[PDB]
Amino acid sequence: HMLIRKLFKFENAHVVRNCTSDRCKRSIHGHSYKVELLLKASKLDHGQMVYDFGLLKGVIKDLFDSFDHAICFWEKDDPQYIDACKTFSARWISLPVSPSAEQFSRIFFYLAQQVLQSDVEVYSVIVHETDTGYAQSFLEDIQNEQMGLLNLEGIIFSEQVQSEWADPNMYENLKQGIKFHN
Amino acid sequence: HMLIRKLFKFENAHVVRNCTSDRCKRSIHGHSYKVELLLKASKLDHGQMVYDFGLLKGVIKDLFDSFDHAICFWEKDDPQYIDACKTFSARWISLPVSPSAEQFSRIFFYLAQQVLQSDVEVYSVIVHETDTGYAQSFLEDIQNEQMGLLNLEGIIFSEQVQSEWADPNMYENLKQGIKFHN
Amino acid sequence: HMLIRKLFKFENAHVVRKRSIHGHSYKVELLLKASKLDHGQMVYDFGLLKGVIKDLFDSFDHAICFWEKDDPQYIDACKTFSARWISLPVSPSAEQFSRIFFYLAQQVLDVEVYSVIVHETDTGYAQSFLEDIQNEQMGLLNLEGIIFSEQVQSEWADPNMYENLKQGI
Amino acid sequence: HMLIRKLFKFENAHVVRKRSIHGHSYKVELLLKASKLDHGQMVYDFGLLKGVIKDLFDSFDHAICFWEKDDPQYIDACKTFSARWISLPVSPSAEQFSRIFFYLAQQVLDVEVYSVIVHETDTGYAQSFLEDIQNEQMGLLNLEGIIFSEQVQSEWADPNMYENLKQGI
Amino acid sequence: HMLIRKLFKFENAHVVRNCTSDRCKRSIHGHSYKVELLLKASKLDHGQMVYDFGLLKGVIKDLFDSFDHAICFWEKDDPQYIDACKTFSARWISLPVSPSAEQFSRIFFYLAQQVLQSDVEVYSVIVHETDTGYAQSFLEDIQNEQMGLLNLEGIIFSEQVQSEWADPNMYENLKQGIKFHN
Amino acid sequence: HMLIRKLFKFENAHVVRKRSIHGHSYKVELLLKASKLDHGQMVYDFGLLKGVIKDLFDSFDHAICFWEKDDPQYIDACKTFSARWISLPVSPSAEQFSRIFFYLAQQVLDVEVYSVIVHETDTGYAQSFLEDIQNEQMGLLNLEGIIFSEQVQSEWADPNMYENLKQGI
Amino acid sequence: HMLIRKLFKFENAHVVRNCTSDRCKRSIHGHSYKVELLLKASKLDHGQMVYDFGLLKGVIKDLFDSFDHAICFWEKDDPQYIDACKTFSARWISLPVSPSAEQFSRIFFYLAQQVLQSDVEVYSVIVHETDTGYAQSFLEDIQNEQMGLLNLEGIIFSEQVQSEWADPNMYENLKQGIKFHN
Amino acid sequence: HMLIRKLFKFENAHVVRKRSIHGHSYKVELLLKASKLDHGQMVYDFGLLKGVIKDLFDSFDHAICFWEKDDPQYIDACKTFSARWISLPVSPSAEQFSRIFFYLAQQVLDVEVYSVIVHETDTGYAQSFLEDIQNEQMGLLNLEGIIFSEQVQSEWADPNMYENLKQGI
Ligand SMILES: [Zn+2]
Ligand SMILES: [Zn+2]
Ligand SMILES: [Zn+2]
Ligand SMILES: [Zn+2]
Ligand SMILES: [Zn+2]
Ligand SMILES: [Zn+2]
Ligand SMILES: [Zn+2]
Ligand SMILES: [Zn+2]
Ligand SMILES: [Zn+2]
Ligand SMILES: [Zn+2]
Ligand SMILES: [Zn+2]
Ligand SMILES: [Zn+2]
Ligand SMILES: [Zn+2]
Ligand SMILES: [Zn+2]
Ligand SMILES: [Zn+2]
Ligand SMILES: [Zn+2]
Structure with a gap:
C-alpha cells in the first residue's frame, strides 16, 4: 500500500536464561534499542493517523516506553530470579517469551497491531540492538x-x-473490546 | 526503467485538527522535512532532464519551496482557525487534505507528476519528518x-x-494545458 | 572541571517580525560543569532533576513561540492557533532559544550551566x-x-x- | 604532547536510588598523553597493556553495577540477578563511570591518562x-x-x- | 548471482546545453561524484577479480579517474563552446551524449562492461551527484x-x-579485440 | 561571546595555473560572534541580512571562478564557457574561498565575522x-x-x- | 522467514597471488573488515538463539575473530611464500581459496552455516572491505x-x-558430528 | 593563522614484536598553518606539492612496515612477503605513523606542518x-x-x- 515508518527508542535490561548445558551461563543484557515501526495505510483517515500529541501514537508510545528503564523477564523463569527481578526494578515487565531483540520485534509488532483497533496495518517491526544487530518481524x-x-x-x-x-x-481497555479513538 | 532520486528539503508548520473525542486535542507541528523524489526515465531528452539552473527542476523546486516557511491548513478546517492561519503567516497553503508527512508525500508526488508535462515519470516520493519517521507515496x-x-x-x-x-x-499555467519546456 | 553534556530535541514554530514564520527541528546540547556529584543536583533520566529540565525543554516542542512586544492582535492569532504557546520576553530565535534554555536550566539548578548549544535544522547553531x-x-x-x-x-x-520556581521552593 | 585516543564500548545495567534501573549502551574515549613511546607502556590491541585495560573495561559489559552503600537486601537482589556484577565505591552513573574508568586506566599505567569521556546512549556524556x-x-x-x-x-x-594490581606487581 | 559493490569517486565539471526556449540558459556543473559499481559474479577466477594493485581494477580506475579534474562536453555542442572547453581544460572528455549524472551512470556502466572482457558482469552503476541525488543505470x-x-x-x-x-x-586496446588480463 | 555558526553549500568550478581545473562540492561554515542581537544585524533565513549573505555566497554556485591576473585569452575562454563567472582578485582555491567569503560577509555586516571554514569535497578544509x-x-x-x-x-x-555595498548605502 | 542481522568486525592481512602475466604483481592487503551475518529464523528456541555471553554466538565469534590480526593465504600458493607467511605471523589461516573480501563472505557464510548444527539458517553474509566496497554471499x-x-x-x-x-x-568438534548446544 | 586540513587514507600491514601483525585501514588528517599562500607551497590535488605528499603517504598503502631493529631473519620474511615494504627507523604503530607522516610532510615543505592525526580503524587515533x-x-x-x-x-x-629530498634539490 503506502509505507509509513515511525521511529521509537527505549533503554532496557532483560534476562536470558540458560540451558542445563554445563557451559551455558545466565546473562543480563542492558542495551540501547531503536525501533522501526513499519505501517501500511490504505486510508489516511484521522482516527488511525499516527503523529505526536495525538491519541493513537500516544498509546503506542506509552506501551513502547513501558520497556524503557524497565527489566524484562520470562514468565517461566525460576521464581527466585523473578522475585529478585521485582525487587531489583519497580519497572518490570513479565513476558510470555524469553526477552530478546528477536522477541521484542514480535512483541512490539503485536502491541502496535492490537492498538490499531480504534486501512492502517502493522507491516513489520525492526528492533536494532545497540551496534550489534537487528531483528525484523x-x-x-x-x-x-x-x-x-x-x-x-x-x-x-x-x-x-x-x-x-x-x-x-x-x-x-484493549483486553476488552474497548475501541480507542471514537 | 532507470531510477533517478532527487533530494529536496523544506521547513514547515502545519495543523492537525482533532476529533470530537474528549481527549483529542488540536496540535501544530513545526518540523524539518526531507524529500526524496524518485523518478523513472525511459529517455533522457533535454526537455525532461532535472538539474540545477534548468527550467524544469526550477519549477519543481519553486513548488516544493512553497511549503518552506509556510503554514499548511486543511480547506475544511474551522474558518476561525483558517483566518487565524492567514493572519499568522503571509506564507500559507490551503490543502484539500489535512496536512501531514503522509499527505505531503502524496501532494509532492502529484505536484511533480503534474509538472512533468512539458519517458520521465514520478515513481515515488518519500517525506522524512525530522527524526521521527517517513511516509512513502x-x-x-x-x-x-x-x-x-x-x-x-x-x-x-x-x-x-x-x-x-x-x-x-x-x-x-499548469491549471491550463500550457506546456512548460518548449 | 567535570564536563557533562546532556542532549535534548524539540520541534518548534515561532515568529519574527516580510514577517516570517519558522518551523524547525531543534537540537539542544546543555553543557554543565560539576564539582560535587551529590544526588540532589544529579542529571539523569527517570529521576527528578532532569525531569524538571526536560519538562521545561519539551515545553517548547509542538508549541508556537512569540514575543511579548509583538503586536497584540497577532498575539491572539498566535494563541488562537494552538493551545501550546509560550510567551517569551525576547523575540524567539535560535539565538534567543540558547539564552532562554540556559536561563531555565540555570534557575533549576555544584552543577552550574556552562553553555547551551541550540542547533536550528541544518543551517547551523547558536551557543550561549x-x-x-x-x-x-x-x-x-x-x-x-x-x-x-x-x-x-x-x-x-x-x-x-x-x-514553584519563581518562589523560594 | 602526543594525544592518543583509544575507544571502548560496553553494555551495562546499573542502579540509582522512585529508584530507577538503567540499561544503556556506553562508549568510552580514553584520552592519553605520551612522551616516551617505550614498548612496555604501549597501548595496542593484541599485546598486553591494552589487554589489561580492555579486560577491566569489558568487565562492565553485560554486568550490573551497584553501590557499596546501597541497602544490603537489594545488593543480594543485585547479585542474585546475574553473576556478572561489579561492586562500586560510588553510586554508578555515567558521571561516575568516567571517574572509575579513569582511575582503573591510571592505576594500570610515560603514558598518563589525560581524560575519559563516557557517552551514555544518545543522551550525552560525562568527561572526567x-x-x-x-x-x-x-x-x-x-x-x-x-x-x-x-x-x-x-x-x-x-x-x-x-x-596483582593492588600489590606492587 | 553474488553481489559485489565497488566504490569510486571523481570530481568533475560538465556542460549542459540549452533549448531554443527563451528562458532556458546554458549551465556548467562542478560537483563531487560518488560511484557505486555493482557487479554480479558467477565465478571468482583470478582474471576477473577486482582489487587494488591488480590490473583489472587498475584499468577500471584509470578510465573512471579520466573524468576527475576533467571537463565533459557533448560532441554535438556548438564548436565555439567545444573549442573554449579545450582551451579551458587540457583534461577534457568528448561524450556522445550530453553530460549528466544520469549519463555518467550509463557511461561508467558501459566502460566497466567493456573492460570486463579479459562470470563477472556489470549489474548496475549508481552515480551520486553531491548531496542532490543519484542516478542508477x-x-x-x-x-x-x-x-x-x-x-x-x-x-x-x-x-x-x-x-x-x-x-x-x-x-x-579495447577498441580492438585485445584481451586484457592473459 | 555568543558563537553563531551558519552553514552554506555551493558547487563550483575554478582554475589554477600542468594547469588544472577543479570541480568540487563545497561546504561553508560561517562563524560569527555576537553581543547585541539587535534585529538589523540578525542572521535568519527568510528575512534580509542573511538574504544578502546567502545571495553573495550562492553567487559561487554553478559558476566558474578565475584570477584577474590569469592570462587574458584564457579569461575569455573562462567566460565564453558560461555566463555564471566571478572574477577574483586572487587565484581561486578553497584557501582563497575562505578568505573571500570572510571578506564578503564582513563587508555586509554587533555581529562580526570570527572565522570561515570552507570544506573542499572530502579532501579537507581551509579556515580563515x-x-x-x-x-x-x-x-x-x-x-x-x-x-x-x-x-x-x-x-x-x-x-x-x-x-550598493561599494558605496555607503 | 524472520530476518536477523548480526554485526562482526575484524582486522586482517591477506595475499592475492598473481598471473604469469607480465604486468600482474603480487599484492598484500591489510584492511578493516565489517561483517553482516544475515539469519532467517523460523523458531526462536534457546539452542539457536544468537546473543552475547551465550555459547552459540561465542563459537561464531571465536571462528570469526580467528581472522583478526591474522594473515590469510591460499593453500596452493608457492610454498616459499607460505613459509614466509608462517614466519611473518603466528596467527595464520590456510584457505582453500585465494583470500578476498569476495571469498571471506563465502567463508564466513560457510563457517556460520556449519556452526548452526546444535529453524535458524544463514541467509547471507556481507563483508565490507574498508571504504572500497562489499561482497555479498x-x-x-x-x-x-x-x-x-x-x-x-x-x-x-x-x-x-x-x-x-x-x-x-x-x-x-564440528569436523566430527559433535553437536554443540545440548 | 590559517588552518588547513588535508585528508589522506591508506591500508597498511605492519609488525610489533606474542608478536602481533596488524592489518588496518588508516585515516590521516594533515594539519597545516599558512601565512603566505604563495603558489610553490600550495597544497592542491592535481598540481605538484601535494603530489609529493600524497605519493609519500600512499607509499604506506598496501605495503607492509617493519622496524630496522627487528631481527634480520624476520625482516627477510617481511620483504619476501611482498615487494611493497617500507623499512622504518622506529617500530611501526599508529603512534609512530603520526610522527613519520609529520616528518615526511615537514621535509617536503610559509606552510608548516602543525599536527598530524592518524586514525587506526575504529579503535582511536594518535595526534603528533x-x-x-x-x-x-x-x-x-x-x-x-x-x-x-x-x-x-x-x-x-x-x-x-x-x-632528491635527502639532497638540497
Ligand atoms: Zn543454553
Ligand atoms: Zn546483550
Ligand atoms: Zn481525534
Ligand atoms: Zn509534529
Ligand atoms: Zn525587518
Ligand atoms: Zn526559519
Ligand atoms: Zn532522590
Ligand atoms: Zn538511565
Ligand atoms: Zn531547455
Ligand atoms: Zn549541477
Ligand atoms: Zn606551478
Ligand atoms: Zn581540485
Ligand atoms: Zn593476474
Ligand atoms: Zn586490498
Ligand atoms: Zn612485549
Ligand atoms: Zn592492530
Whole structure:
C-alpha cells in the first residue's frame, strides 16, 4: 500500500536464561534499542493517523516506553530470579517469551497491531540492538506458535510501569473490546 | 526503467485538527522535512532532464519551496482557525487534505507528476519528518480517493508564496494545458 | 572541571517580525560543569532533576513561540492557533532559544550551566555562555516574562513546578 | 604532547536510588598523553597493556553495577540477578563511570591518562579529568572498593590481574 | 548471482546545453561524484577479480579517474563552446551524449562492461551527484537508443587524460579485440 | 561571546595555473560572534541580512571562478564557457574561498565575522580568521576586485546590492 | 522467514597471488573488515538463539575473530611464500581459496552455516572491505564449485589462532558430528 | 593563522614484536598553518606539492612496515612477503605513523606542518605535534632511516623524488 515508518527508542535490561548445558551461563543484557515501526495505510483517515500529541501514537508510545528503564523477564523463569527481578526494578515487565531483540520485534509488532483497533496495518517491526544487530518481524512471525504465542494477557506490566501511562486503563481497555479513538 | 532520486528539503508548520473525542486535542507541528523524489526515465531528452539552473527542476523546486516557511491548513478546517492561519503567516497553503508527512508525500508526488508535462515519470516520493519517521507515496496512493483526491485547484498557494516564484503564472499555467519546456 | 553534556530535541514554530514564520527541528546540547556529584543536583533520566529540565525543554516542542512586544492582535492569532504557546520576553530565535534554555536550566539548578548549544535544522547553531545571559542589550531574562500556556503547563509532571520556581521552593 | 585516543564500548545495567534501573549502551574515549613511546607502556590491541585495560573495561559489559552503600537486601537482589556484577565505591552513573574508568586506566599505567569521556546512549556524556579523580566530594576512589564478581573475574586473560594490581606487581 | 559493490569517486565539471526556449540558459556543473559499481559474479577466477594493485581494477580506475579534474562536453555542442572547453581544460572528455549524472551512470556502466572482457558482469552503476541525488543505470538503460547509443569510439579522452593512464594504449586496446588480463 | 555558526553549500568550478581545473562540492561554515542581537544585524533565513549573505555566497554556485591576473585569452575562454563567472582578485582555491567569503560577509555586516571554514569535497578544509584577511602576502581583498558576472548578478534578490555595498548605502 | 542481522568486525592481512602475466604483481592487503551475518529464523528456541555471553554466538565469534590480526593465504600458493607467511605471523589461516573480501563472505557464510548444527539458517553474509566496497554471499555462492568448494578441513587455523578459542576443540568438534548446544 | 586540513587514507600491514601483525585501514588528517599562500607551497590535488605528499603517504598503502631493529631473519620474511615494504627507523604503530607522516610532510615543505592525526580503524587515533618529532626518547627521525622498497618507489610520479629530498634539490 503506502509505507509509513515511525521511529521509537527505549533503554532496557532483560534476562536470558540458560540451558542445563554445563557451559551455558545466565546473562543480563542492558542495551540501547531503536525501533522501526513499519505501517501500511490504505486510508489516511484521522482516527488511525499516527503523529505526536495525538491519541493513537500516544498509546503506542506509552506501551513502547513501558520497556524503557524497565527489566524484562520470562514468565517461566525460576521464581527466585523473578522475585529478585521485582525487587531489583519497580519497572518490570513479565513476558510470555524469553526477552530478546528477536522477541521484542514480535512483541512490539503485536502491541502496535492490537492498538490499531480504534486501512492502517502493522507491516513489520525492526528492533536494532545497540551496534550489534537487528531483528525484523513480519506478520507470519507473530502467529508463529513455534516462536511463542502472543496474547495481551501474557504481557504483564508493573504497577510503576502503569503509573507513567497517560491512561491507567489503556491496556485493560484493549483486553476488552474497548475501541480507542471514537 | 532507470531510477533517478532527487533530494529536496523544506521547513514547515502545519495543523492537525482533532476529533470530537474528549481527549483529542488540536496540535501544530513545526518540523524539518526531507524529500526524496524518485523518478523513472525511459529517455533522457533535454526537455525532461532535472538539474540545477534548468527550467524544469526550477519549477519543481519553486513548488516544493512553497511549503518552506509556510503554514499548511486543511480547506475544511474551522474558518476561525483558517483566518487565524492567514493572519499568522503571509506564507500559507490551503490543502484539500489535512496536512501531514503522509499527505505531503502524496501532494509532492502529484505536484511533480503534474509538472512533468512539458519517458520521465514520478515513481515515488518519500517525506522524512525530522527524526521521527517517513511516509512513502506510490502511484496507487495518488489516485486513492479514500486518501483524498488531489487536483491542482485544491491546493491554494498564498500571494506571498507566489511572490517568490520565478514565474508568477507557473501554477496557473499548469491549471491550463500550457506546456512548460518548449 | 567535570564536563557533562546532556542532549535534548524539540520541534518548534515561532515568529519574527516580510514577517516570517519558522518551523524547525531543534537540537539542544546543555553543557554543565560539576564539582560535587551529590544526588540532589544529579542529571539523569527517570529521576527528578532532569525531569524538571526536560519538562521545561519539551515545553517548547509542538508549541508556537512569540514575543511579548509583538503586536497584540497577532498575539491572539498566535494563541488562537494552538493551545501550546509560550510567551517569551525576547523575540524567539535560535539565538534567543540558547539564552532562554540556559536561563531555565540555570534557575533549576555544584552543577552550574556552562553553555547551551541550540542547533536550528541544518543551517547551523547558536551557543550561549553565561555572559550572553547577563546582557540587557540581548534582552534581559527573568522568569515571569517567560509565560507558558495552560496546556503547555498541562503536560508537565508537576503542573505547578514553574510557579514553584519563581518562589523560594 | 602526543594525544592518543583509544575507544571502548560496553553494555551495562546499573542502579540509582522512585529508584530507577538503567540499561544503556556506553562508549568510552580514553584520552592519553605520551612522551616516551617505550614498548612496555604501549597501548595496542593484541599485546598486553591494552589487554589489561580492555579486560577491566569489558568487565562492565553485560554486568550490573551497584553501590557499596546501597541497602544490603537489594545488593543480594543485585547479585542474585546475574553473576556478572561489579561492586562500586560510588553510586554508578555515567558521571561516575568516567571517574572509575579513569582511575582503573591510571592505576594500570610515560603514558598518563589525560581524560575519559563516557557517552551514555544518545543522551550525552560525562568527561572526567584528573582533578575530578582527586575529589572526596565526588567520592574517593581506591582500588579495593571496586569489587568485581567471581564470574566477571573469570573472563579475564589473567583472572588474578586485579589482585596483582593492588600489590606492587 | 553474488553481489559485489565497488566504490569510486571523481570530481568533475560538465556542460549542459540549452533549448531554443527563451528562458532556458546554458549551465556548467562542478560537483563531487560518488560511484557505486555493482557487479554480479558467477565465478571468482583470478582474471576477473577486482582489487587494488591488480590490473583489472587498475584499468577500471584509470578510465573512471579520466573524468576527475576533467571537463565533459557533448560532441554535438556548438564548436565555439567545444573549442573554449579545450582551451579551458587540457583534461577534457568528448561524450556522445550530453553530460549528466544520469549519463555518467550509463557511461561508467558501459566502460566497466567493456573492460570486463579479459562470470563477472556489470549489474548496475549508481552515480551520486553531491548531496542532490543519484542516478542508477541498469543493463536496459545501456542499450536504450532513446537514451543515446554508447560506443567506445564516441567517448574521446584528451591527450592529457591519456597522459595519466598506467597504459597509454588501454582504450585503443579495447577498441580492438585485445584481451586484457592473459 | 555568543558563537553563531551558519552553514552554506555551493558547487563550483575554478582554475589554477600542468594547469588544472577543479570541480568540487563545497561546504561553508560561517562563524560569527555576537553581543547585541539587535534585529538589523540578525542572521535568519527568510528575512534580509542573511538574504544578502546567502545571495553573495550562492553567487559561487554553478559558476566558474578565475584570477584577474590569469592570462587574458584564457579569461575569455573562462567566460565564453558560461555566463555564471566571478572574477577574483586572487587565484581561486578553497584557501582563497575562505578568505573571500570572510571578506564578503564582513563587508555586509554587533555581529562580526570570527572565522570561515570552507570544506573542499572530502579532501579537507581551509579556515580563515581575521588576520588572514589582513595579509597583502595572501593577496589583498577589496570589494571591486571581486567582479561577479551579469548573470550571477541576475539571480540576486536585488541585482544592485553589490553596487550598493561599494558605496555607503 | 524472520530476518536477523548480526554485526562482526575484524582486522586482517591477506595475499592475492598473481598471473604469469607480465604486468600482474603480487599484492598484500591489510584492511578493516565489517561483517553482516544475515539469519532467517523460523523458531526462536534457546539452542539457536544468537546473543552475547551465550555459547552459540561465542563459537561464531571465536571462528570469526580467528581472522583478526591474522594473515590469510591460499593453500596452493608457492610454498616459499607460505613459509614466509608462517614466519611473518603466528596467527595464520590456510584457505582453500585465494583470500578476498569476495571469498571471506563465502567463508564466513560457510563457517556460520556449519556452526548452526546444535529453524535458524544463514541467509547471507556481507563483508565490507574498508571504504572500497562489499561482497555479498548467498547460499548458491557457497555450493558453487566454480567459486571453490568449501569444506571444514580446507580451512586450517594456526596453533596461536586456536590458542585464543574459548574451546580448543571447537573446530575439530564440528569436523566430527559433535553437536554443540545440548 | 590559517588552518588547513588535508585528508589522506591508506591500508597498511605492519609488525610489533606474542608478536602481533596488524592489518588496518588508516585515516590521516594533515594539519597545516599558512601565512603566505604563495603558489610553490600550495597544497592542491592535481598540481605538484601535494603530489609529493600524497605519493609519500600512499607509499604506506598496501605495503607492509617493519622496524630496522627487528631481527634480520624476520625482516627477510617481511620483504619476501611482498615487494611493497617500507623499512622504518622506529617500530611501526599508529603512534609512530603520526610522527613519520609529520616528518615526511615537514621535509617536503610559509606552510608548516602543525599536527598530524592518524586514525587506526575504529579503535582511536594518535595526534603528533612538532614537539613529538623532536624526541630522541620517541625515536629520532631522519630521512635515510625510512627506506621505501623498490616497488613502492616504482609507483611514484618521480621515482627519484625521495633521493632528491635527502639532497638540497
Ligand atoms: Zn543454553
Ligand atoms: Zn546483550
Ligand atoms: Zn481525534
Ligand atoms: Zn509534529
Ligand atoms: Zn525587518
Ligand atoms: Zn526559519
Ligand atoms: Zn532522590
Ligand atoms: Zn538511565
Ligand atoms: Zn531547455
Ligand atoms: Zn549541477
Ligand atoms: Zn606551478
Ligand atoms: Zn581540485
Ligand atoms: Zn593476474
Ligand atoms: Zn586490498
Ligand atoms: Zn612485549
Ligand atoms: Zn592492530
